[PDB]
Ligand binder design. Structure first.
Ligand SMILES: NC(=O)C1=CN([C@@H]2O[C@H](COP(=O)(O)OP(=O)(O)OC[C@H]3O[C@@H](n4cnc5c(N)ncnc54)[C@H](O)[C@@H]3O)[C@@H](O)[C@H]2O)C=CC1
Ligand SMILES: NC(=O)C1=CN([C@@H]2O[C@H](COP(=O)(O)OP(=O)(O)OC[C@H]3O[C@@H](n4cnc5c(N)ncnc54)[C@H](O)[C@@H]3O)[C@@H](O)[C@H]2O)C=CC1
Ligand SMILES: NC(=O)C1=CN([C@@H]2O[C@H](COP(=O)(O)OP(=O)(O)OC[C@H]3O[C@@H](n4cnc5c(N)ncnc54)[C@H](O)[C@@H]3O)[C@@H](O)[C@H]2O)C=CC1
Ligand SMILES: O=c1ccn([C@@H]2O[C@H](COP(=O)(O)OP(=O)(O)O[C@H]3O[C@H](CO)[C@@H](O)[C@H](O)[C@H]3O)[C@@H](O)[C@H]2O)c(=O)[nH]1
Ligand SMILES: O=c1ccn([C@@H]2O[C@H](COP(=O)(O)OP(=O)(O)O[C@H]3O[C@H](CO)[C@@H](O)[C@H](O)[C@H]3O)[C@@H](O)[C@H]2O)c(=O)[nH]1
Ligand SMILES: O=c1ccn([C@@H]2O[C@H](COP(=O)(O)OP(=O)(O)O[C@H]3O[C@H](CO)[C@@H](O)[C@H](O)[C@H]3O)[C@@H](O)[C@H]2O)c(=O)[nH]1
Lengths: 459, 456, 459
């Protein structure tokens, strides 16, 4: 048995790129990506994709209309498929039991029930969404309770490890592929059918197979470790400001230890993105349920450090602006949660902006990729109409500003003409570098007259 | 300025090896290692050194030519261009900061002795692990005791070697770290120390920083390393509650090249002279700098390590029917890591103290640890009523449980068939090191009950 | 159709002695051998002076001993000949190690199980009468299974005890119920039925309850927690009565006439004592933590905390009433046993009140009609005792030259003392602190005599 038609439920940052890459690497597999969101599906069927990922357009364009399809017809795409990926979102619950902590599984469950509603025959159902440990067992129980003659649904776990902004490079050359399934003959056979898909472009030695729960736990563990490295160096950065040390020199010296490695040691105003906080919290919430309070409070520190790193930076801005930013114009340079994406989910720029808005600052926000309307949405819930301007270029944001706040490490911000900017800022003029992108320009900036501050450098 | 005469105060683990390697690599540089203890200096000149692989060869290669070991501290200081400070910096066992803060009295003593014995220009390098900003204290002592023409430059040059691999780590280090003042005088001194290391270390691997970055990098490095162990150990507790295997999880985690695959081996808890001592110093320092969030962040590295030992001990007590009073328990393994006989902060000590408090009879075996050092570490007797020091088979004669606390290879190749028949039943085995992976089926078969970190 | 004809009891204490004595009295055709490692205790059992005081015990022992009742230090031989083996050893709270001050010490239980298996052949029934933590029985099962011998068949039963000290013989001869726990295996029921038939000589079958091992162990812990809680509840009301001018005895009557509440165990006191109530609530508390029920743990913890408050409160009232100082003041303590009709002092409130007053430097003269002097000394020792503690031969010697009379145990004789005689020889002003309400109805006479009388639950 061999997978020949693939259906993917969820046309988001995971569903689209992963399916686009599968189609591009397996010309003989038909890959259909489906979603309830019609405007998102329409945009996938357009010259202007709904997300910005470098090289995604070229991949999509190569296979769309041939063996890659984007549709709102969820039902037909399930009936046709040999393999169904579940790739819907799993946000933190904002309500009820576990509000602010537990994963929200309602989209997952709606998938599982639409799958068993539309399925006949043999299908492999593969949970790619990041879910709590034992969640695949939930899907298995829904299927077993709703069996039909000749219906044989197998459940696999297949966690996704791409990072946004490098999704295509990550999907074409993954560090590893992880697949969990039962230890039964049917489970192993289903695992092997999914292996065969990835083996069109990924070496077998890079494909890890385990059971379902080990698989789900590895995904959470991996994200928490990555988040921990950032929070660890961000904590070091606070120690650096207090002692005269420099966090970049410390990160360099530590990273040269091969047992530690040199990746993910770039101090910042705080990690953003849709999954780091929600996945650590999911891990914390699970610990509570399993009577592991010590494990819960150990990983909670990764989130508390990150919140402290953000609130620290907002206070510096206010405290350096003579402890009042009411009615002062402040340029926010960079709103995406990192560079090379238009995605703002949990971006540190949202939290810095809201802290400054609470003080009555007039924000002018520039980002080269994030859409105008998404910034308004993120800073909503008006305060926005009175205090927030979206700028079309960095110079208009800095025009008449008291302070320039770099929140996203876009390459272009290093190259700006800061003499032009200084000339038209109010005096004294501040730059708060939340990303360490202006290292090496500090002396030049100082001569120009800016008071420049950055994470992990004593003032 | 060219460093041609080197003196090093402290002929300990850090002191001699580093200086022996320097002399071996730098043939025309005079290297004199001096120390308070004469008995130790005589052992450094004797056939038996006070052991690291390859060290005996490097010592005898150049001792007497450009490498000397004298008890004559003051003359070594007097004509040396470079003075290494490599003295022990124990934790304070008293006073403010008790048990956490570093005790700088041996460094202070070195600073005052250096300034008394020095004229002209000398570079003074702190190799010891010190709290950040310690170099400021050394400079203060120097500036307060100035005399004409005296010019002492203070650098930081922390060491990173691991015990057991010192010569490999020193002939081929991942990096050499040198911090000094970001002043013209400071850069003179830094370049002179670099030029030393450049005789065998590529310039690419010689990182230079300001003094405080160099001090902090040493602490922060040990803390990241220990944070990794605590992180996987915390994961190992989850693997037990969820039916995952910490070995498979760790393989999956470690294949992310941004995480790396090193220091992900779950254990009963990290020992060694420095991981706990240096995270604790880091924490103490944060408290003093009014960074409580940072402090409680790094405290979790120790709290998790403490919890991993405590919960291992509870597992033993709870599996043995909730009481180990007057039960014989074998401790196989007392050193903090395999293939050495060093016990500092070893996990066995804590596991053994947890079981002595219950009144269990511990029979301890270790192939490399002296039996006088085990006694000392379980003391301050209650030791004599509960602790007899065994070969491993007699440590397991009539025991209820075998507890493996150090990953000795010899523990894999034992005759657990024989051991099981001469143990009380039910016979238990508690593997705190995952050294019995792959043999579990047999053990269950032998009738043994086996429990390990991160499984079941 | 299997008959128990020889019975061994391991542990000749306040449970083993009485229970087997009534067994021998009510079943003349069964031989009951009581054993213990304590040689002075067993010899006391073989004397005209028994090691404990229970009303009616001397009659029952002497009417059976050397007939079918026996006491011996020969532990091994009693086991080999025995069809039924009781384990009645002590399960004190651990004073060391993990769970110090909370968890039950099982060292003596295990030693019994291992001595039994080393001395057993053929068929025997092993019954756990000691109060053990839930699932303790299972542990005995697994020591028996791991040390099997060619024709062994040790069945394991739970059979908690509900006698109260002071009324043990009445309670053993007319128990409200008998509780037996055993396996649902075929021979599980056969072994339960065997032990039933022993009790059915004198207990009606309707009063014998049969369940499984772990429900029976839990029923015993829960029973003591409910009883202790009634005492703590009325004691807390006693504090409210003092503050509001109500009488706790009147309020207890009003409460207790509700038949859903019942009128037993509503006698307010200085505080509950005895070897089992505190150690068993704590055992329940320690079990909740391990089972991840911190809410249940802190609910039952209140029973203990309220008891400790009642005692502290009582001592503080003595000290406050004596002009806030009792250093060098002679104070009479009447009643040292933990309740009346026993010589037993285990966890007696008299110990705690005495230690509170010794901490103040008071000089105490203690009288108790049954507690032997040596025992009092041990209870107060760890001298401070040589300087501060006198053990009196009669109550008037205790009261001679005293500032205060503190009644801690409800012996009937304290109502009958000659308080006029006592008052003439006390230092003035003279106080009585009635921690048992035994002097109710004497308050007016006592006042006219000139005493300042204070009691629990009255303003
Ligand atoms: N964003 C990232 O970089 C990665 C995220 N993940 C995980 O992958 C999952 C998906 O994440 P994203 O793509 O970022 O989310 P997203 O919100 O961008 O996209 C999920 C899509 O699912 C659709 N959807 C939800 N319920 C549906 C239903 N019942 N039927 C059909 N469509 C439905 C939504 O309309 C949405 O377009 C999450 O579990 C996330 O934690 C894992 C790796 C990478
Ligand atoms: N043990 C390790 O793996 C490493 C330790 N370090 C740091 O290096 C330092 C040295 O540690 P070790 O070499 O293990 O200790 P050690 O105790 O073996 O060596 C210290 C030596 O200095 C001598 N000494 C102490 N005070 C003296 C004084 N006032 N005058 C003259 N000699 C004096 C001692 O007698 C001894 O010979 C510590 O701060 C440690 O944290 C850094 C890297 C690795
Ligand atoms: N005392 C009471 O009012 C009640 C107590 N219980 C429970 O009954 C049990 C016994 O209580 P008590 O009789 O008051 O205690 P106890 O301390 O007066 O009697 C236990 C006896 O067992 C002996 N013993 C200890 N280890 C032994 C061993 N290995 N072999 C033989 N004998 C050994 C002790 O020396 C002692 O004489 C406890 O679990 C208690 O909680 C249950 C109901 C009533
Ligand atoms: O050294 C660093 C690295 C990252 N960040 C920040 O950390 C966040 C996370 O970035 P990154 O991990 O690169 O992007 P994500 O898109 O969130 O990818 C993460 O989250 C995905 C969703 O689960 C995982 O699949 C990926 O492996 C994991 O890298 C961003 O705000 C970054 O700016 C830093 O501040 N310093
Ligand atoms: O995956 C792992 C790796 C190590 N350990 C334990 O962690 C401890 C540390 O081992 P190791 O790092 O080899 O010991 P040290 O000799 O103390 O070396 C550390 O301490 C030195 C003193 O500061 C530093 O120079 C080194 O870089 C640092 O590795 C030992 O008890 C190990 O058993 C684990 O439990 N799991
Ligand atoms: O209304 C009351 C009843 C009792 N007490 C005190 O509470 C303690 C316990 O007394 P009691 O329950 O009569 O005696 P125990 O010997 O502790 O008997 C209890 O503990 C035994 C051991 O578990 C159980 O078998 C019994 O059922 C249970 O009553 C004593 O200090 C009493 O003076 C009061 O203060 N007020």
């Amino acid at each position: 048995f061999e997978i020949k038609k693939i259906c993917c439920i969820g046309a988001g940052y995971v569903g689209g790129p992963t399916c686009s890459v599968i189609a591009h690497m397996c010309p003989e597999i038909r890959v259909t990506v489906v979603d309830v969101n019609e405007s998102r599906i329409n945009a996938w069927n357009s010259p202007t994709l709904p997300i910005y990922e470098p090289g995604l357009k070229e991949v999509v364009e190569s296979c769309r209309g041939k063996n890659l399809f984007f549709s709102t017809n969820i039902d037909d795409a399930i009936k046709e498929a040999d393999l169904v990926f579940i790739s819907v979102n799993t946000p933190t619950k904002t309500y009820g039991m576990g509000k602010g902590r537990a994963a929200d599984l309602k989209y997952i469950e709606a998938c599982a029930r639409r799958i068993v509603q539309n399925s006949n025959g043999y299908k492999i159902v593969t949970e790619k969404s990041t879910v709590p440990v034992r969640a695949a067992e939930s899907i298995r129980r829904i299927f077993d309770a709703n069996t039909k003659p000749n219906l044989n649904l197998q459940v696999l776990s297949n966690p996704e490890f791409l990072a946004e902004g490098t999704a295509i490079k990550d999907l074409k050359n993954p560090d590893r592929v992880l697949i969990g399934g039962d230890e039964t003959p049917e489970g192993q056979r289903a695992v092997q059918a999914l292996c065969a898909v990835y083996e069109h472009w990924v070496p077998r030695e890079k494909i890890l197979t385990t059971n379902t729960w080990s698989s789900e736990l590895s995904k959470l563990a991996a994200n928490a470790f990555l988040a921990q490295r950032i929070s660890s160096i961000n904590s070091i950065s606070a120690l650096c400001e207090a002692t005269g040390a420099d966090v970049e020199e410390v990160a360099t010296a530590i990273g040269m230890d091969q047992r530690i490695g040199n990746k993910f040691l770039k101090a910042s105003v705080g990690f953003g993105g849709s999954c780091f906080q929600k996945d650590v919290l999911n891990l914390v919430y699970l610990c509570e349920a399993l009577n592991l309070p010590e494990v819960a409070r150990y990983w909670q520190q990764v989130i508390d450090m990150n919140d402290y790193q953000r609130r620290r930076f907002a206070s510096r801005i206010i405290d350096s602006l003579f402890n009042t930013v009411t009615d002062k114009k402040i340029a926010i340079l960079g709103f995406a949660f990192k560079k090379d994406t238009g995605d703002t989910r949990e971006s540190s720029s949202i939290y810095i902006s809201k802290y400054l808005m609470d003080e009555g600052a007039h924000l002018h926000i520039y980002d080269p990729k994030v859409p105008r309307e998404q910034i308004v949405v993120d800073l909503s819930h008006d305060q926005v109409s009175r205090l927030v301007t979206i700028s079309k270029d960095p110079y208009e944001a800095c025009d008449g500003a008291h302070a320039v706040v770099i929140c996203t490490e876009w390459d272009m911000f290093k190259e700006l003409d800061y003499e032009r900017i200084h000339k038209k800022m109010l005096k004294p003029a501040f730059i708060f570098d939340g990303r360490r992108v202006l290292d090496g320009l500090h002396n030049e900036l100082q001569t120009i007259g800016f008071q420049i501050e950055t994470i992990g450098k004593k003032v």
